[PDB]
Design an enzyme around this catalytic site. Structure first.
Site, PDB file in Angstrom:
ATOM      1  CD  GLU A   1      -2.392   1.547   2.525  1.00  0.00           C
ATOM      2  OE1 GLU A   1      -1.576   2.192   3.214  1.00  0.00           O
ATOM      3  OE2 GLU A   1      -3.540   1.259   2.918  1.00  0.00           O
ATOM      4  CG  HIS A   2       3.633   2.927   3.167  1.00  0.00           C
ATOM      5  ND1 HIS A   2       4.224   4.137   3.457  1.00  0.00           N
ATOM      6  CD2 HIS A   2       2.855   2.623   4.232  1.00  0.00           C
ATOM      7  CE1 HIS A   2       3.823   4.546   4.646  1.00  0.00           C
ATOM      8  NE2 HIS A   2       2.990   3.647   5.137  1.00  0.00           N
TER       9      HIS A   2
ATOM     10  CD  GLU B   1       3.314   5.536   8.070  1.00  0.00           C
ATOM     11  OE1 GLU B   1       3.154   4.337   7.763  1.00  0.00           O
ATOM     12  OE2 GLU B   1       3.022   6.478   7.306  1.00  0.00           O
TER      13      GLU B   1
END
Ligand SMILES: CCCCCCCCCCCCCCCCCC(=O)OC[C@H](COP(=O)([O-])OCC(O)COP(=O)([O-])OC[C@@H](COC(=O)CCCCCCCCCCCCCCCCC)OC(=O)CCCCCCCCCCCCCCCCC)OC(=O)CCCCCCCCCCCCCCCCC
Ligand SMILES: CCCCCCCCCCCCCCCCCC(=O)OC[C@H](COP(=O)([O-])OCC(O)COP(=O)([O-])OC[C@@H](COC(=O)CCCCCCCCCCCCCCCCC)OC(=O)CCCCCCCCCCCCCCCCC)OC(=O)CCCCCCCCCCCCCCCCC
Ligand SMILES: CCCCCCCCCCCCCCCCCC(=O)OC[C@H](COP(=O)(O)OCCN)OC(=O)CCCCCCCCCCCCCCCCC
Ligand SMILES: CCCCCCCCCCCCCCCCCC(=O)OC[C@H](COP(=O)(O)OCCN)OC(=O)CCCCCCCCCCCCCCCCC
Lengths: 440, 74
Positions: free
Chosen positions: A59-60, A136
């Site tokens: 996704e990143h 993150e």
């Protein structure tokens, strides 16, 4: 309009299917904007221990660059036409949706193909995103809500893929290579497990043409998950330096379809939600909320109904100080047992109205409508029209709630995840004994 | 002295399990017996000697009483 003609007049979401299995679905309207997105049926639930965290990594990497659009070119198209591109990957779903003008629908869909089909997954980009994911993760450690919910999933579905966090362990983050990401996107972004969902001013015929022109060259026509095992336990991450103590207690809820979802939500609507900066406070009809506002037990609480394909967590999460966990746990269990033993008609009517407001107000704007289309097509296999939801809520009564809550709450071993100054938190035996009443 | 302000502990995580999902007699003899043997082995050298001394004194005193209650050849 008497709210019946209103529900009947909601435009119908046409659903089609390409030869690859792409379930193209759209809900035309009058707005000049639109939200077109792709919902993948990938997520951490489909990831083994070694592959855990690859979904978040992919996704990143999705928006960084594509083979046809090298790097910022993909970004350049998104901003230059004013579109907002976004993605979200939960434990059992992934989605990339691009809000844009209805005129730019031909372009956006093409980009939506490029992001999903022809990614780049560059190695230097992989290193940079590996660092970013590590920071993150250290960010996600900060807030106690996400940490507590991940703890709940770990202690409720221990020994199963559902226990895995979405981002995965930090170990896997460093040790995930490009081969793993390529294999993940190859075997989890397959055509049948895809929903191209669009809302706003898009006509279904145009969406079908664009999908058949850009998404045609996709997978043909397997990790089909395993039934996870709820295991009532408790995790206590006692850390007295934290300001407040976050607790989350959940029982094995229903599945995605599992019609008992409609009553349970109503029951949860009875308990409701509250925090410090609310309105009426000591007058809100939710007994637990009124008690919390009167005695200032907590700074927050809510009732969640996280439901997965074959199982799900149903319960409440509250944030209170270090010396009010016991009292609020008692009152929460008391509200639960009261609902199971004696629901009363008036509270059921209030819950029905509250749930009607939930479903109706949540489905406004292109983004929530498109998200609902994608999620419903993935989970229910259809899009449950609001009229059907209205009928299902109307069928609910006091007896139905009293029975459904009894089947899920009364004398059931719960799963508890507490974090912070949780010395006051009752021992698991006391919590389990709270699930049953000697007066009933 | 009630729960909530007893002490200050940090960075500890405890995992538990519902009593309805775990056995109440897990290997009551597979590890019960070796554990009992270790427990008694690590304590018998300190517990036994006093009582064994008492037993020797008891038997000696009783037989001393018995053979002092007899008749003396005179
Ligand atoms: C008769 C059957 C029991 C009954 O109807 O209990 C109703 C009620 C308990 O209601 P519940 O729905 O089971 O629990 C929720 C309550 O809000 C109470 O919730 P709580 O969290 O405040 O307390 C939980 C727990 C707290 O633990 C206790 O109360 C301890 C129970 C005794 C053992 C420890 C002390 C002695 C050693 O309470 C109990 O175990 C029940 C109350 C005590 C019953 C036994 C009293 C005589 C013991 C001899 O207890 C009483 O009314 C007590 C008097 C009548 C029963 C005894 C005669
Ligand atoms: C004045 C005299 C009359 C009144 C005395 C009252 C004293 C308290 C008795 C009740 C009580 O609370 O006992 C708790 C006390 C400890 O609780 P537990 O569940 O037995 O603890 C087991 C260990 O956690 C784990 O022990 P483990 O690792 O050795 O494995 C289990 C077992 C060894 O496994 C066996 O099968 C035992 C050897 C055969 O060892 C035991 O101590 C189990 C009970 C053996 C009898 O009970 C006993 O030690 C057994 C009953 C006590 C009386 C007989 C002692 C000989
Ligand atoms: C003697 C009986 C009481 C001692 C042994 C049982 C015990 O300690 O608790 C059993 C019972 C229920 O206690 P508990 O499991 O805390 O549940 C309370 C309601 N939620 O607590 C009781 O007091 C049992 C009911 C009354 C007899
Ligand atoms: C020393 C041994 C006996 C201790 C006292 C037994 C009291 C009655 C309960 C009982 O029978 O326990 C023994 C055994 C195992 O019981 P438990 O560890 O709770 O696991 C149940 C699921 N197999 O359960 C049984 O044997 C019966 C159920 C099988």
């Amino acid at each position: 309009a008497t709210y019946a003609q209103a529900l009947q007049s909601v435009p119908e979401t046409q659903v089609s299917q390409l030869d690859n299995g792409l379930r193209v679905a759209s809900e035309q309207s009058s707005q000049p904007t639109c939200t077109v997105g792709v919902w993948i049926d990938a997520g951490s639930r489909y990831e083994n221990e070694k592959n855990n965290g690859a979904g978040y990594f992919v996704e990143h990497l999705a928006f960084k660059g594509t083979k046809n659009r090298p790097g910022s070119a993909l970004e350049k198209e998104v901003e230059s036409m004013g579109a907002h591109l976004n993605a979200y990957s939960t434990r059992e779903h992934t989605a990339y949706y691009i809000k844009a003008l209805s005129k730019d629908l031909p372009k956006a869909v093409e980009l939506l193909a490029d992001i999903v089909q022809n990614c780049s997954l560059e190695d230097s980009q992989i290193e940079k995103e590996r660092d970013v994911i590590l920071q993150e993760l250290q960010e996600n450690d900060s807030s106690m809500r996400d940490v507590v919910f991940d703890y709940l999933h770990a202690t409720a579905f221990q020994g199963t893929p559902l226990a895995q966090s979405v981002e995965g362990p930090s170990e896997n983050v460093r040790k995930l290579s490009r081969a793993d990401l390529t294999e993940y996107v190859s075997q989890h972004y397959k055509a049948p497990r895809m929903v191209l969902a669009a809302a706003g001013g898009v006509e279904h015929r145009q969406l079908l043409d664009l999908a058949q022109k850009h998404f045609s060259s996709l997978s043909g026509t397997v990790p089909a998950f395993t039934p996870c095992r709820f295991t009532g336990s408790e995790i206590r991450h006692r850390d007295d330096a934290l300001p407040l103590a976050h607790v989350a207690i959940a029982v094995e809820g229903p599945g995605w379809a599992n019609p008992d979802n409609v009553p349970l939500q109503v029951a949860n609507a009875i308990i409701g939600h509250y925090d410090s900066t609310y309105g009426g406070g000591t007058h809100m009809s939710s007994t637990l909320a009124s008690v919390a506002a009167t005695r200032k037990l907590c700074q927050s609480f809510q009732t969640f109904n996280i439901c997965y394909a074959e199982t799900g967590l149903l319960g409440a999460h509250f944030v209170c100080d270090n010396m009010s966990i016991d009292d609020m746990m008692f009152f929460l269990q008391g509200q639960w047992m009261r609902l199971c033993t004696s629901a009363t008609e008036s509270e059921v009517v209030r819950g029905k109205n509250i749930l009607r407001n939930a479903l109706v107000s949540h489905l406004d704007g292109t983004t929530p409508v498109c998200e609902d289309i994608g999620r419903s097509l993935l989970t229910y296999g259809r899009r449950i029209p609001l009229a059907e939801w209205e009928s299902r809520i109307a069928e609910v009564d006091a007896s139905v709630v009293r029975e459904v809550c009894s089947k899920y709450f009364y004398d059931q071993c719960p799963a508890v995840a507490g974090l912070g100054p949780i010395e006051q938190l009752p021992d698991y035996n006391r919590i389990r004994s709270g699930m049953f009443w000697l007066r009933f | 002295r009630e729960f909530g302000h007893l002490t200050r502990m940090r960075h500890v995580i405890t995992y538990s399990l519902s009593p309805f999902e775990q056995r109440a007699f897990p290997h009551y003899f597979t590890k019960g017996i070796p554990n009992v043997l270790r427990r008694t082995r690590a304590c018998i050298l300190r517990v036994a000697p006093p009582f064994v001394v008492f037993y020797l004194v008891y038997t000696w005193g009783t037989q001393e009483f018995e053979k002092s209650k007899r008749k003396n050849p005179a």
